[PDB]
Subunit: 397 residues, 4 copies
C-alpha cells in the first residue's frame, strides 16, 4: 500500500539517488521539493515543559537546513551521524579540540594539507600535544610509530598536494588492534571515489568547500562519525566553539551535492587525458595522477579508488623554479591561477608560494613539494581547451 | 604575448568551456573567480557629465550579475545578446508586448506550453491581436497560415507536453521569405541539444527555471535576440515592464548552467533507458521519446537534435483517466508528483489536471493530451530506482 | 485560556506591532521566529485528488515566503489582499494590463513617476488606450476631466519628483460617484504617513524598492486591493505575466518592513531640519517639503499626512543649470549622487538628466522639473553631516 | 577641491553616519551603493610575483564583504581593527585559544553568558588553564584576584542575565598597571550605549547575532582589537580555526547595523516604560533595569551608559519557580518564548531551564538567577501590546 511520497519498503536506494534525495523529503507543511532556508537565529517554544519538542532552540547548536545536509552527508559517507562546520579547518580543529589533551601523541601524514599541518604545529602543540609527521604510504610505518600516548592517527588520501595514498583499510586494522582513533581527510577523494568509514575509519573530515560544493561558491566542513558516542562529542564541542555551518551554506551544498557523481566523473575523465598528455610532454619532468600507469602507488589506487582516480593531478616542469614561474604566468583561460580545488573551473596552483609558503624549502623538498612543482585541479571544461592552454604555457616555459 | 587571466587571441572556447566560463571573467577589483552578487538597487555616478560612465544606474534597467548571465546565455545560444526575466512567462509576454499591436496576427503551435496558450487567449487577445493555433509538424501549415498582418510565428520544439518537433530551419526559411519574426521556445531542448538561432530563428525564449537551473531552485526567463535591433527593443520594454531577473537568481543560474551539459547527458541516458522499458510494458499503450524507433518524427529528431534526445518523455497508460490517476497516486520516491521539469529530481505529472486543465477535454484530446497521457521529466537519480518506481506505479494502474 | 504563541482575543495589535509581526507567526514545523525562505520552484502534491491541498503548486503562481509578505502588506495598507511583484513598474504595468482595454480613457497625474508616464505613453497607448495627463492638485480638475470612457484615475501623492499632493479622499469620493477605479501610487508617502485605501482608494501601488526596503537592497512592487474581486484579477494576471516577487526578495522586505516606522520617523525629522536649512540658504531659490510652513499645499499635507511629512524634499539652486551641476558635482559623502530614494543612505538626484531625461525641456518646465531642480532623498545619517555636505556643495555652486 | 563620492578631508563623520556608511564606499567598478556579496571561495592572481596584489586569495583567510563589515565595526567600536566570526562563541573561543596556554590564569565574571562559562569550565580547563569566576561589580575584586599567571581579565557589562555592570574604566586601569589583557563582552550594551575600547579595554567581543543583526536573521561574532599586534594574532588564529564569518552573513549585518541607533533608541524607550510598569505590579518581586531608580549600580550606569539604558531588563515574579513557569506558558503574542535577545521581536525567557540550566540550582541562586527570575529582550513593537501581554501573563502567575 505504497502511495506517492513514500519509498518502496525494503529497497536501499542506489548511490546516485542518495546524492539527489539523501536526507531530504518534500517540506511537510507546503510540499516544497527543496527544503526551505531557515535563515533564522532562534526557535519559539510551545511551553517551558515542551522545551525542544520541535527539535530546535538556537541555530549555533542546530539548524533545520544544516541538519538536512548532515543527514545526506552521513548517508553518502556511510556514517552514524555528520556535523557541518563553517570550514574544513573548523571541522579538523574540532577533531583535535575534542580527542586530544595535554600529554597526548598524534600521528599525522607528513604530506597533510598545509593548514592541518600548521594548526597542529603552530597552535595545538602549545597545549603539550605531540604531533609526529610520518610517511603514511607504508602502513607498518604507522604501526611502528604508535606510542603508548597515541590517541589519534590522522590520515589523508590522496594527500594535498603530492597525491600520496594511505592504505585506509590497513591503517584502520592497525588502529583497531592498538585502540587508537583513526581520522581520515578524504577531501581529495570525495565519497564517490573512497569512503574511509567503509574501510574501518572512526572519523572522516571533509572540506565541503572543494568537491561537495565544486562551484567555488561556499566554504564548508563536515565531520562524519562511525558511532553515536563520537558524533555526540563532536556535536557538543561544535556548539561550544560556535563554528557550525550557516543555513544558506547548507542550502548551496544540498544543491551542489546532487551533481557530485556526474561532476567527479567528468573532472576525472578530463584529469586522465590531461595526465596522459603531460606524461608525453618533452618539457614535463614528472606527472603524478593515481590513474596513469606510472603512478608509484598504482596497486593501492586500484584497490582503494572506486569509479575514478579524481580531478587532482600534479607535475614538475623541466628547468626548476624559473620554468615553473614562466609556465604559471603564461597559463591562459580557461585555466584560473589561484588557491583551492575540486571546482567546475580548472585551477592551477603553485603550492611553494600559495599553499605551503610557511614551510621551509629544505622541508618542502623533503616531503616532495619540489622546485617546479604544479598542483592541478581539473574542472568540467572541454579537455581540448585545457590541454591547448597547458601546451601553450609549457611552450612558453 | 599572452599572460595568465587572458583567453588566447583568435581562439573560440569549445561548447562545455562556454557553459563553465562564458560571459564571466574574474572580478577585476579582487580577482574573485565567481562574479560577486550585486544585491543592490542603485549605482552612484562620478558626476552629472559622467552619467552611466561605469555602465549602471538602476537594477530594474540593468544589473552587473544579470548582465554577466545574459552574456553567457547569448554565447551558449549563439545570439547577439540576451535579456533575463523573473520567469519564462515574463520573457514570453515581453515578446508579445514588444512585437504585437492591435490588428496584428500571431501563429502559435497548438501544442504550446499551457501558460503561453492562456496569456495569448485570455489576455493579449483583448488588444484585438489575432492568435491562430496550428500544427507546426508540417512547415507548409505555417507558410499557408501567414497573413499580411502576421508579425510573429511562435514555435516550440520539443512541444509541451506531447514532444512534437517543429522543423526550425524550414520554418525560419518561410519566415525570412515572408519577413515575419520566428520566435522559438526551445526550453525542452536546451541549447546543448538544439540552438534555434543556429537554424535561422530570429528570437529564442527560454524558461531558465527548467534546465538552465535544473535544481528546482529559481524561476527565470531569457530572450536571446539574433540582432542588435531586436535586442534593444526587448531591453527597452523589459525596463518598462519591470520584469528583469534579480541578481540573486542570476548568480544561482550562473552556477547551475556550468553543469547543464553533464546534467542533460545523464538525464537523456536515463530517459532513453526509461523509454525503452516503458515501450515493452504491457500496461503502457504508447511511449513518446525522440530516441526510440517508434517516434513519429525520428527523421527530423536525427537532423535537429545534437548529442542527446533530452530528459523529457511521455507515455499513455492503458485504461484511460482512472488508470492514469491510480498510477500517479502510487508513483513512489524518488519520483516527485508535481508541476515543472528539467531538474536533477525526476518529476511525473498528468497534464490533464495539472498544467493543461483550463483546456476543455474535447480540445486537449484534439491536440494530443489523451486520457491516460503522462509527462515525465527524467532527473539524474540511478535509472534502476526510477524504473522500479514506474514499474510499481504501473502495477496499480 | 490564552497560552504562549496566541494573541489576546478581541485585541487589534497596534501599528508598530503589525510592522514587526504582521502576516508572520513562528514556523509551525520548527518554531523558527522568522519564516523560512522557500527558495523553491515546484511543490509536491499528496495525490491527483488532493491537488493544492497544502496551498502551493508553482512559485510563479504563489510562494509561501511571498504570501507571508503579501499578508503583512495587506494588513499595513488596510486592504483585502496584496500581490507582490519583481518591481514597482511590474505592479503598475499589471494594473494597466488588467483594468484597461482598447477605447478606454485613463486620467494620470501629469507629475506621475517618469516610468509610469513613459509606460503609458510609449507602450499601453499603442493598444488604443487614451492616457490624459492632468493637474491632480485640484480634485475638480479630475471630476471635470472624467469622460464616459474613463475606467481608471491614477493618482500619486506625494508626486515624483515635484512633491505635489492629490486629495486622495476627495478624488476617491469623485471616483465612487462616477463609478471609476481609483489607483493611488503612495510610494513617496509609505503607509506610515498615508494609506490611500483608508481614504477610499480602490487600489494602492507601492514600489517596495524605496521605503518598504529602505536599504537600497532589493527591487519590489506591491498591489494592495480594497476588494476580493480586484485582488483575484491582479493575482490571475500576475501568474500569466510571470512578474511575481522572488522568495529571497520577500524575505529581505519582511525583515526591512519591521523598522519602517522608526526609519521614516528619523528620515522625516532629518528632512524637516534640512528643508528649514535650505529655506534659509542665500543660494537656494525654492525649497519644496510638505512639512515647512511655505509648502503651497500645506492644508492638504496637514489633513492627509499622519506622523511625518516624509524623507523626500526638493529645491532649486540660484544660477540655473550650471549652478545646479556645480553643486551636484561637489556634494560630498555621506551623500550619494544616484537614482532611487527612501533608503537609509541619503541620495541627491538631478531628475532632468537621471529620471526625466526622456521628457522634452518645454514639458519638464511645464510640470515643474525646472533648470536647477534637485530631488533629495533624506536617510538616517547624522543631520549635521548631511547639512555640512549640502552647505559645502552650495558654497561651491 | 573635493568632488562627489569623497568625504571632506579633515572631517570625522558623526555617530549615526558611521553606522550607515562606516567602512563602506560605492563599488569602484560599478558604483553599486552597497558593496556586492563575494559569494566566492578563491581569488585569481595576476601572476606568481603579484600574489595578493589585489589583497585576497582564499575566503577562509579574508573575504571583501567580511572585510567591509570589519572596517565598519572597528570604526563604530573605536578599535584599530576587527575580525568577524561565524558566531559570538567563535569570537570568544578565538580569544581563549590565542591568549591562554597551559599554566595561565583567566579571571571571568561569575555572571558571564552561560556558553562562555561552559567553553571555559568544560573545554579550555582540560589544557591546564585556570579559570576563576569572581564578582566584577567591585573592581578591587579583580585587582586582588590577579596572579603572575593571569593573561586575560574577561568582563561583561551589562552581564547576562542579571544585568550587573562592570566599571570598564577602573578594571582597564588595574589591567594596564598589572599588564593583563582586558577583554570586554559588551553584547548587551552595543557600541551605541558603551564602547569598552574608549574606556581602556584591550579587546571587545560582540555577539553580532544579538543587536548588530537585531532581526533574528544571522549568527555572528566580532573581535575588535585596540592595537595592530592584538589584531594580527586574532586574524592569524581565525585563519587556523576556520571560524570566519560568511560573505552572506556579513552583507546581512552590513545592512542591519545601519538602523542599530534608531532600533536601540526604540527598544530602550519601550524597556524604560516596561520596567516602570513591572516596578508597580503587585505580582512582581524585583525589577532590574539600569534606567529605574531601584537599580543597585545607578551611579556607574549614569557614568558608563551613553544615550540609553538598553533593551534588556529582568524581573523576579512572586511565588518562585511554579509562578515563573505559569507566567512563561501564558505570555501571549507579540512576545516570543525562546532563547536569544536584541531583536525587533520582543523575547522573554526563564534562564533557569533555557540558557543557564547546566549550572546547578545552588550556584545559579548564588550568582543571582533566582527561582522566578525572567530575562526580557524588548523589541520595537508598540509598548502597549508588550505591557498588555506581560499584564495578562502575570495574572496567571
Ligand atoms: C582545503 C582543505 C582543507 C581545509 O578546508 P577549508 O574549507 O579550506 O577550511 C583541509 N584538508 C584538505 C585536504 C583540503 O584540501
Ligand atoms: C515552464 C515553461 C514556460 C514558462 O516558464 P516559467 O519560468 O514557468 O514562467 C514556457 N515554456 C515552456 C516550454 C515551459 O516549459
Ligand atoms: C521608483 C518608483 C516607481 C517604480 O518602482 P520600481 O521598483 O523602480 O520599478 C513607481 N512609482 C514611484 C513613485 C517610484 O518612486
Ligand atoms: C549570545 C551571546 C554570546 C554568544 O554569541 P553567539 O552568537 O550566540 O555564539 C556571548 N555573549 C553574550 C553576552 C551573548 O548574549
Amino acid at each position: 500500500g505504497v502511495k506517492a511520497g513514500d519509498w518502496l519498503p525494503g529497497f536501499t536506494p542506489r548511490e546516485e539517488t542518495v546524492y539527489v534525495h539523501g536526507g531530504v523529503e518534500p517540506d511537510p507543511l507546503t510540499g516544497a521539493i527543496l527544503p526551505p532556508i531557515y535563515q533564522n537565529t532562534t526557535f519559539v517554544q510551545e511551553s517551558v515543559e515542551n522545551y525542544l519538542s520541535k527539535g530546535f532552540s538556537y541555530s549555533r547548536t542546530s539548524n533545520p537546513t544544516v541538519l538536512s545536509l548532515e543527514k545526506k552527508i552521513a548517508e553518502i559517507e556511510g556514517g552514524f551521524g555528520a556535523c557541518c562546520f563553517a570550514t574544513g579547518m573548523a571541522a579538523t580543529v574540532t577533531i583535535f579540540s575534542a580527542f586530544l589533551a595535554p600529554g597526548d601523541h598524534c600521528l599525522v601524514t607528513n604530506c597533510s594539507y598545509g593548514g592541518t599541518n600548521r594548526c597542529a604545529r603552530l597552535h595545538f602543540s602549545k597545549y603539550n600535544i605531540d604531533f609526529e609527521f610520518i610517511d603514511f604510504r607504508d602502513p607498518t610505518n604507522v604501526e611502528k610509530a604508535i606510542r603508548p600516548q597515541t590517541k589519534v592517527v590522522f590520515s589523508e588520501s590522496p594527500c594535498n598536494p603530492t597525491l600520496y595514498l594511505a592504505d585506509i583499510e590497513a591503517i584502520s586494522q592497525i588502529c583497531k588492534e592498538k585502540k587508537v582513533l583513526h581520522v581520515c581527510d578524504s577531501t581529495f577523494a570525495t565519497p564517490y571515489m573512497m569512503r574511509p568509514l567503509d574501510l574501518g575509519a572512526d572519523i572522516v573530515v571533509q572540506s565541503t568547500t572543494k568537491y561537495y560544493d565544486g562551484h567555488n561558491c561556499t566554504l564548508g566542513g563536515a565531520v562524519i562519525s562511525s558511532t553515536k558516542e563520537i558524533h555526540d562529542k563532536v556535536f557538543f564541542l561544535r556548539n561550544v566553539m560556535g563554528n557550525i555551518m550557516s543555513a544558506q551554506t547548507a542550502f548551496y551544498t544540498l544543491l551542489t551535492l546532487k551533481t557530485l557523481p556526474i561532476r567527479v566523473e567528468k573532472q576525472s575523465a578530463n584529469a586522465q587525458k590531461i595526465a596522459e598528455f603531460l606524461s608525453k610532454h618533452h618539457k614535463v619532468e614528472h606527472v603524478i595522477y593515481p590513474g596513469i600507469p606510472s603512478f608509484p602507488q598504482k596497486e593501492l589506487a586500484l584497490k582503494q579508488h572506486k569509479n575514478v582516480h579524481g580531478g587532482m593531478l600534479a607535475f614538475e616542469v623541466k628547468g626548476g623554479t624559473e620554468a615553473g614561474i614562466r609556465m604559471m604566468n603564461h597559463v591562459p583561460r580557461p585555466w584560473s591561477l589561484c588557491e583551492s580545488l575540486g571546482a567546475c573551473e580548472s585551477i592551477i596552483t603553485c603550492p611553494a608560494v600559495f599553499t605551503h609558503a610557511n614551510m621551509l624549502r629544505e622541508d618542502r623538498l623533503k616531503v616532495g613539494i619540489t622546485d617546479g612543482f604544479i598542483r592541478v585541479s581539473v574542472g568540467i571544461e572541454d579537455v581540448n581547451d585545457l590541454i591547448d592552454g597547458l601546451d601553450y604555457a609549457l611552450s612558453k616555459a
